[PDB]
Design a protein around this ligand. Structure first.
Ligand SMILES: CS(=O)(=O)NCC#Cc1ccc(N2C(=O)[C@H](CC[C@H](O)c3ccc(F)cc3)[C@H]2c2ccc(O[C@@H]3O[C@H](C(=O)O)[C@@H](O)[C@H](O)[C@H]3O)cc2)cc1
Ligand SMILES: CC(C)CCC[C@@H](C)[C@H]1CC[C@H]2[C@@H]3CC=C4C[C@@H](OC(=O)CCC(=O)O)CC[C@]4(C)[C@H]3CC[C@]12C
Ligand SMILES: CC(C)CCC[C@@H](C)[C@H]1CC[C@H]2[C@@H]3CC=C4C[C@@H](OC(=O)CCC(=O)O)CC[C@]4(C)[C@H]3CC[C@]12C
Ligand SMILES: *[C@@H]1O[C@H](CO)[C@@H](O[C@@H]2O[C@H](CO)[C@@H](O)[C@H](O)[C@H]2NC(C)=O)[C@H](O)[C@H]1NC(C)=O
Ligand SMILES: *[C@@H]1O[C@H](CO)[C@@H](O[C@@H]2O[C@H](CO)[C@@H](O)[C@H](O)[C@H]2NC(C)=O)[C@H](O)[C@H]1NC(C)=O
Ligand SMILES: *[C@@H]1O[C@H](CO)[C@@H](O[C@@H]2O[C@H](CO)[C@@H](O)[C@H](O)[C@H]2NC(C)=O)[C@H](O)[C@H]1NC(C)=O
Ligand SMILES: *[C@@H]1O[C@H](CO)[C@@H](O[C@@H]2O[C@H](CO)[C@@H](O)[C@H](O)[C@H]2NC(C)=O)[C@H](O)[C@H]1NC(C)=O
Ligand SMILES: *[C@@H]1O[C@H](CO)[C@@H](O[C@@H]2O[C@H](CO)[C@@H](O)[C@H](O)[C@H]2NC(C)=O)[C@H](O)[C@H]1NC(C)=O
Ligand SMILES: *[C@@H]1O[C@H](CO)[C@@H](O[C@@H]2O[C@H](CO)[C@@H](O)[C@H](O)[C@H]2NC(C)=O)[C@H](O)[C@H]1NC(C)=O
Ligand SMILES: *[C@@H]1O[C@H](CO)[C@@H](O)[C@H](O)[C@H]1NC(C)=O
Ligand SMILES: *[C@@H]1O[C@H](CO)[C@@H](O)[C@H](O)[C@H]1NC(C)=O
Ligand SMILES: *[C@@H]1O[C@H](CO)[C@@H](O)[C@H](O)[C@H]1NC(C)=O
Ligand SMILES: *[C@@H]1O[C@H](CO)[C@@H](O)[C@H](O)[C@H]1NC(C)=O
Ligand SMILES: *[C@@H]1O[C@H](CO)[C@@H](O)[C@H](O)[C@H]1NC(C)=O
Ligand SMILES: *[C@@H]1O[C@H](CO)[C@@H](O)[C@H](O)[C@H]1NC(C)=O
Length: 1232
């Protein structure tokens, strides 16, 4: 049972006996145990020498000597046994050779007795040698550590982990040293080691037992080539052969313009424009001090128009109603598009072109339905685990919680629905994603990720306990030791803690700890706060019928999860989501709060009716109010709204939630201003003796029509210019609003003028109006209280200083601008998805995957093509997957956390003849056809390719012939690599076997804010451009070959890379024709134009500043609201400014006083008080996009408009206003 003598030249065993009686089980075919024989080494010649030279190249010692101690049977058994490990480690030949060197030194070395002590045997009967079942081996520490370190970084791209992580048992790749690695190699409990070998890594200073000396042989270093191999390992594979480059500085972040922040550019632009305009305006004032009729043209035209309209009022009302009904009739063809991708992004953007390419070539990205579960009040605890130290465990990991979650998951898997179209029950196995067995799938094949997958969703295995004696002490093993083992080493076929439990999921895939649990730091997997249950379903195109079935199943999923959410509030806090939830939640409340909004029309009707009358009695106001004109106003507004929506429905343009819930109420806030001002001016001007009411209304319309035309044109032009946004919802909003404003103006100049004529006709008869069968408080208040106060000599410099202070303060506050909109922001206030997004932001440890997709034009069959893509030994440095690996080493500068997988490296590795993966039938019915790795017959002794002196590279014919076999070969214990699961959907093959498109999957780091999605997009695009530029240098590459980074979030966040240049350019385009129309229409006074433009700039800057303070981010929706501000503020500025300009008072102060009282009262009572019921009613929206971006911004715009129009502007007109237009002075004097 031992080796009595071990001087030199002798070995401890030679012939291979039968099977090992002790283990009895295994994963694969094992290796028979050698029989003990202490005997001098054998003289190895002939074919035995050829076998030795091939199997163990570091034992051949000359042509004619080569003493060794193993038979041909042991050499063949060793060659069979190491095929799996060689299949994993062949990427770095130095590592493969070192591992094989260790095994063939143990098995066949002629100096076997110098380091091996046999300790335990089993007798095989009298006259027979006993078989060896346990022994120990002695090595130097430096030898084993160099051998380990040469293999320490070899990677498994398909699993995105280290190969050493599958070879160190309970210790993962993070905690594995040479001792643990060698202990795993000798541990028979894993189902792989044929016999028990104890490894002593005896140190050199240490004194050793009698004749034993530690082994110290040759170890191939990482970076050193051996002979003429030229197969030096790349540093992705061993981390010792690439030059050191200091970590790259991060790139200039998006939301920065040029070399400076975007807000700094905003301050520079607004300040420069303001100071230039102010300097020019004051220059004109001092020039006027040194110096000590288009209005009539439009007046005459509008008087003729008004008189014709007043002449025939019933006919024009008839045509107005006919046109309004004819346009509104288009609502029968209305179509609503509810998908987020369609509204959020343009159909011909860059991200959508990439999305279309990916979806066409590889299929759409699968639908992910997730559940996050945490523990409400359970405390943590300790567990004295086996093979590890004491481990803290979280409260959520309590066994009863896992049992009820197992009941939940199993209940969800067996959920079935009725399909009205298919006329059958749809179960999970009909629509689920399945990486293994895609066709003829079952429930056991569906992709479902959870912690419970470590126990293959089997209740009996979860509750199992076992007795294990380690270090001489018997203890108890339960599910927690399997959990810790799998969390550290997820690539385990068999656990060693007395339980033969696979660590793989039931559908055949490893479950990585970041996919099962979350809420941890470092490698403290047992402390995880939240558990994650993920269902992945196949996606399809929207038109395809299968999508409806998937949506029905997800609906049942949502109802079941709401049931389990309500049922157990005493144990868990649960967040959950479904793929269709985002589409359902955003569009849920379009209709629900619309009758709540409808009260604004009633409030506007009542305000217009009461404000224009209801006086002198306060008890007969029911008949003295102007009910007819209120009804007219509200009908004109509704007419414009319905006509605009109808016309766009007639052109096939769809509508959305930004149309239904916003457009009638913003148009309500705008449209009634012009008629309120017109009616007030009608009441104020007295009639001349002998004049008819038609001429009076004509003269009134001639008086006020240029300003109403100015406001309508300015707002309509601003909305149409605001339609340049790439976002379709905002584009549709802008076009609908523009058309509604134009049609509103056209109805105001025809139907309302006619209605005022008919109401005046009724008024002259001193009769009650249709429905209800020379002073005023506004003018007295403004004349006696407001105007003596605002224009007082001790007020005007204070108002000037206060408003310039406010402007400067808002320019400062403009620095705090957020760019981008969070997903939560879109949701309704009470949606369950808000909890889901909070749980994702706190508990996931990885982000979404990113696929670097290569288009057609790249020859993957050429050796130059393979070398510019692979990352194994002999591949070119700075290759595609090595660039991705390098980007993955610095996750904060480039938002990639997990290195890419690659079909090329696994294909080349699979083709390797030494890996026993690609075999051909040598004889029989299927001669020269593919022999699967699971065929255990003797018909498959011919490898796919021949042996080589370097890396394995096929020719073009071999590449095209063998690639469809690789892409359909399922992985198993015999061959780990294969493309059925990981790569079948990642390569597109045309019928001549050509590669049309290909993708390389990698994972982002967790992304939480809009800034993280935007920066991840920028860094990922920069990496893909860097890959594309170097791939284009390979000869034969098409000039239109590119690599692009598809991920599902790109179509939502692409727009935030350009939103600032587009927003600034759009605002400047809004400012230019506004100035042009107010300059040209009001009589070509440069002073008045500059005054209006400066006021609009101040209102806009104040709006942006206070927006930044409040916490409203900048995006396309805020942009269209600021465009609305630029348009709308003309209604607060232009009327007062024109009233000042058209005035005959000799001094600036008197003109400021009279313009302030008359038009200030009209502007206040009309514009402000009409704006409030519309805008304020959106504060009950319950959809956060409207509550935040439409209510708050339009409210701020209205208040700043009122503040600037009524307080600032009269004072500025008093100081810096235009001089007197002498043509009206002469007109007043001559006609006097
Ligand atoms: C020998 S050692 O010394 O080195 N140390 C011990 C070791 C090891 C080791 C080596 C390689 C790996 N993998 C890669 O590489 C593989 C990485 C991922 C792989 O692409 C994959 C497979 C399926 C899938 F959906 C998604 C991805 C992994 C592997 C997994 C499963 C597998 O086969 C399945 O197994 C299931 C089961 O057993 O339950 C059966 O149900 C299925 O039918 C059968 O297809 C073979 C290899 C993992 C562990
Ligand atoms: C006077 C103010 C307060 C409201 C006038 C505005 C109208 C222009 C709105 C109010 C009611 C809306 C309609 C009410 C509900 C629907 C049904 C809707 O169809 C669905 O609900 C299907 C939704 C789905 O399939 O998810 C299509 C839009 C439509 C016609 C809306 C079109 C726009 C309308 C007529
Ligand atoms: C008269 C015109 C010029 C403006 C009138 C509009 C006000 C009604 C707005 C303008 C600024 C707003 C404030 C800006 C800042 C905030 C912080 C905001 O919440 C935060 O971002 C801080 C909360 C936290 O995270 O601690 C709560 C609303 C509030 C008080 C806003 C309350 C409403 C205010 C006073
Ligand atoms: C080789 O292994 C044998 C088997 O254990 C060792 O023999 C035992 O050594 C211990 C050490 O004190 C003694 O107490 C036992 O009496 C020995 N004999 C047995 C178990 O039969 C032997 O010492 C080892 N030799 C070397 C060089 O390490
Ligand atoms: C292979 O890598 C090693 C380590 O990066 C290189 O450098 C050796 O580094 C050790 C540690 O300081 C020194 O003791 C050796 O003298 C260094 N040189 C050699 C030749 O071992 C080594 O140069 C690299 N070899 C090649 C060919 O690149
Ligand atoms: C591989 O890519 C081709 C196109 O390069 C895909 O073929 C298209 O498939 C869509 C439907 O999926 C058809 O509408 C197109 O007409 C097809 N075009 C051509 C040129 O054939 C093919 O489907 C992709 N492979 C897979 C498996 O989806
Ligand atoms: C859940 O796990 C148990 C293991 O305890 C499985 O039960 C074994 O099934 C095999 C195959 O039929 C039998 O040979 C064993 O005798 C069973 N063991 C016991 C204790 O009954 C069980 O099949 C698993 N569940 C499923 C659905 O496969
Ligand atoms: C990719 O490159 C390989 C060679 O690098 C091309 O294979 C050649 O194909 C032509 C076509 O008959 C043969 O005449 C050559 O002899 C082949 N060369 C070799 C080395 O085998 C292959 O055609 C290229 N791919 C494409 C799509 O053109
Ligand atoms: C891809 O990125 C790498 C690293 O960022 C670039 O390599 C550097 O390029 C600059 C010039 O752009 C050189 O001055 C440096 O010497 C290069 N090396 C290093 C280590 O910084 C590479 O050029 C990029 N590819 C392209 C096509 O621009
Ligand atoms: C292994 O042992 C079994 C049983 O003794 C025997 O049938 C088989 O041929 C042996 N194989 C090798 C390669 O030694
Ligand atoms: C479909 O499932 C429901 C679930 O209760 C069941 O009642 C019904 O009979 C099933 N239909 C078929 C055809 O299996
Ligand atoms: C494990 O051993 C202990 C100690 O005798 C014993 O009490 C317990 O029942 C054993 N467990 C099983 C499952 O047999
Ligand atoms: C829900 O909770 C009740 C007790 O609150 C329990 O009896 C029941 O089994 C739970 N599950 C279902 C599906 O009702
Ligand atoms: C690709 O790498 C192999 C490595 O052996 C080399 O032989 C071959 O010449 C390389 N091809 C090119 C085009 O450099
Ligand atoms: C190389 O491979 C080819 C085809 O697989 C085969 O015909 C040939 O015999 C092999 N060996 C040599 C030395 O060419």
């Amino acid at each position: 049972l031992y080796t009595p003598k071990h001087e030199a030249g002798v070995c401890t065993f030679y012939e291979e006996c039968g099977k090992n009686p002790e283990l009895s089980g295994g994963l694969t075919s094992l290796s028979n145990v050698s029989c003990l024989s202490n005997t001098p080494a054998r003289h190895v010649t002939g074919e035995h020498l050829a076998l030795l030279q091939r199997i163990c190249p570091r034992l051949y010692n000359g042509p004619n000597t080569t003493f060794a101690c193993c038979s041909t049977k042991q050499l063949l058994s060793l060659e069979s046994s190491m095929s799996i490990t060689k299949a994993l480690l062949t990427r770095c030949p130095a590592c493969s050779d070192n591992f094989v060197s260790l095994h063939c030194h143990n098995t066949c070395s002629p100096d076997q007795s110098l380091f091996i002590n046999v300790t335990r045997v089993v007798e095989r009967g009298a006259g027979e040698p006993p078989a060896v079942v346990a022994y120990e081996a002695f090595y130097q520490r430096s030898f084993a550590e160099k051998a380990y370190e040469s293999c320490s970084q070899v990677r498994i791209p398909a699993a995105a982990s280290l190969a050493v992580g599958s070879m160190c048992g309970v210790y993962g790749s993070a905690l594995c040293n040479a001792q643990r690695w060698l202990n795993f190699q000798g541990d028979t409990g894993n189902g792989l080691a044929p016999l028990d070998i104890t490894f002593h890594l005896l140190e050199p200073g240490q004194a050793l037992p009698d004749g034993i000396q530690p082994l110290n042989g040759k170890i191939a270093p990482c970076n050193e080539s051996q002979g003429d191999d030229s197969a030096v390992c790349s540093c992705q594979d061993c981390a010792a052969s690439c030059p050191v480059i200091p970590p790259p500085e991060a790139l200039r972040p998006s939301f920065y313009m040029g070399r400076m922040p975007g807000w700094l550019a905003l301050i520079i632009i607004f300040t420069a424009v303001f100071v230039l305009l102010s300097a020019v305006l004051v220059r004109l004032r001092v020039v006027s001090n040194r110096n000590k009729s288009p209005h009539t043209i439009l007046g005459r035209f509008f008087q003729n128009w008004g008189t014709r309209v007043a002449s025939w009022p019933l006919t024009v009302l008839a045509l107005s109603f006919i046109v309004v009904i004819a346009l509104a009739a288009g609502l029968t063809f209305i179509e609503l598009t509810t998908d987020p991708v369609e509204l959020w992004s343009a159909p011909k953007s860059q991200a959508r072109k990439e999305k279309s390419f990916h979806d066409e070539h590889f299929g759409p990205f699968f639908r992910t339905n997730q559940i996050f579960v945490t523990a409400r009040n359970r405390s943590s605890y300790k567990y004295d685990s086996l093979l590890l130290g004491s481990k803290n465990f979280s409260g959520i990991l309590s066994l009863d919680f896992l049992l009820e979650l197992l009941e939940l998951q199993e209940r969800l898997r067996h959920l079935q629905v009725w399909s009205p179209e298919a006329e059958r029950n749809i179960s999970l196995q009909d629509i689920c994603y399945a990486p293994l067995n895609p066709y003829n799938t079952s429930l056991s094949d569906c992709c479902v990720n959870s912690l419970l997958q470590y126990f293959q969703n089997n209740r009996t295995l979860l509750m199992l306990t076992a007795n294990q004696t380690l270090n001489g002490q018997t203890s108890l093993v339960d599910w927690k030791d399997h959990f810790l083992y799998c969390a550290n080493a997820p690539l385990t076929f068999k656990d060693g803690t007395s339980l033969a439990l696979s660590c793989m999921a039931d559908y055949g895939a490893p479950v990585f700890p970041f996919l099962a649990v979350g809420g941890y730091q470092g490698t403290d997997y047992s402390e995880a706060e939240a558990l994650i249950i993920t269902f992945s379903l196949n996606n399809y195109p929207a038109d395809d019928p299968r999508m409806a079935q998937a949506k029905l199943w997800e609906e049942a999923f949502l109802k079941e999860m709401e049931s389990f959410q309500r049922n157990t509030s005493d144990k868990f806090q649960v967040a959950f989501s479904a793929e269709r939830s985002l589409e359902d939640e955003i569009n849920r409340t379009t209709i629900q709060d619309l009758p709540v909004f409808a009260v604004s029309y009633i409030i506007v009707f009542l305000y217009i009716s009461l404000a224009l009358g209801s006086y002198s009695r306060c008890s007969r106001v029911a008949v003295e109010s102007k009910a007819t004109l209120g009804l007219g106003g509200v009908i004109v507004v509704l007419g414009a709204v319905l006509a605009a929506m109808g016309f766009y429905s007639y052109l096939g343009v769809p509508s959305s939630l930004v149309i239904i819930q916003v457009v009638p109420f913003l148009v309500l806030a705008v449209g009634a201003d012009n008629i309120f001002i017109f009616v007030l001016e009608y009441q104020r001007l007295p009639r001349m003796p002998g004049e008819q009411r038609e001429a009076h209304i004509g003269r009134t319309l001639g008086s006020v029509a240029p300003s109403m035309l100015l406001c309508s044109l300015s707002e309509a032009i601003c909305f149409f210019l605001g339609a340049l946004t790439p976002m379709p919802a905002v584009r549709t909003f802008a076009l609908t609003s523009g058309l509604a404003i134009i049609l509103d103006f056209l109805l105001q100049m025809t139907a309302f003028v006619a209605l005022l004529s008919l109401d005046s006709k009724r008024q002259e008869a001193s009769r009650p109006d249709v429905l209800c069968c020379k002073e005023g408080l506004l003018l007295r208040f403004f004349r006696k209280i407001y105007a003596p106060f605002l224009l007082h000599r001790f007020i005007r410099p204070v108002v000037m200083l206060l408003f310039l202070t406010l402007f400067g303060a808002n320019l400062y506050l403009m620095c705090n601008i957020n760019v981008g909109l969070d997903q939560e922001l879109a949701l309704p206030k009470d949606s369950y998805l808000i909890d889901y997004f909070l749980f994702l932001n706190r508990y996931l440890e990885v982000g979404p995957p990113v696929y670097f997709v290569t288009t057609s034009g790249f020859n993957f069959s050429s050796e130059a093509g393979m070398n510019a893509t692979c990352s194994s030994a002999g591949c070119k440095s700075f290759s595609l997957t090595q660039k991705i690996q390098y980007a993955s080493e610095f996750p904060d500068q480039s938002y990639v956390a997990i290195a890419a997988s690659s079909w090329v490296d696994d294909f080349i590795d699979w083709l390797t003849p030494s890996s026993s993966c690609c075999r051909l039938y040598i004889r029989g019915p299927h001669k020269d056809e593919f022999c699967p790795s699971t065929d255990t017959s003797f018909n498959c002794l011919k490898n796919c390719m021949n042996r080589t002196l370097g890396p394995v590279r096929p020719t073009a014919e071999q590449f095209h012939k063998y690639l469809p076999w690789f892409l359909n070969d399922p992985p198993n214990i015999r061959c780990p690599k294969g493309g059925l699961a990981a790569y079948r959907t990642s390569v597109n093959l045309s019928s001549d076997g050509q590669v049309i498109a290909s993708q390389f999957m990698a994972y982002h780091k967790p992304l939480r804010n809009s800034q993280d999605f935007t920066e991840a997009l920028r860094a990922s695009r920069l990496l893909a451009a860097n890959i594309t530029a170097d791939l284009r240098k390979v000869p034969g590459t098409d000039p239109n070959f590119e690599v692009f980074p598809y991920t599902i979030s790109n179509v939502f966040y692409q727009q935030y890379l350009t939103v600032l240049p587009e927003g600034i350019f759009t605002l400047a385009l809004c400012f230019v024709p506004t100035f042009v129309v107010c300059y040209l229409l009001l009589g070509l006074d440069m002073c008045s134009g500059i005054l209006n433009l400066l006021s609009i700039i101040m209102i806009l800057v104040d709006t942006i500043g206070l927006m930044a303070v409040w916490g409203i981010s900048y995006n396309a929706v805020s942009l269209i609201n600021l465009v609305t501000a630029v348009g709308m503020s003309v209604e607060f500025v232009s009327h007062i400014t024109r009233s000042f300009a058209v005035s005959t008072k000799p001094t600036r102060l008197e003109r400021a006083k009279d313009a302030t009282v008359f038009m200030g009262s009209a502007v206040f009572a009309g514009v402000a008080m009409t704006n409030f019921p519309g805008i304020l009613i959106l504060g009950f929206a319950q959809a956060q996009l409207i509550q935040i971006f439409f209510f708050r911004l339009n409210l701020l715009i209205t208040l700043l408009g009122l503040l600037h129009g009524l307080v600032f502007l009269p004072v500025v007109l008093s100081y810096l206003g235009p001089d007197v237009n002498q043509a009206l002075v002469q007109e007043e004097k001559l006609a006097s």
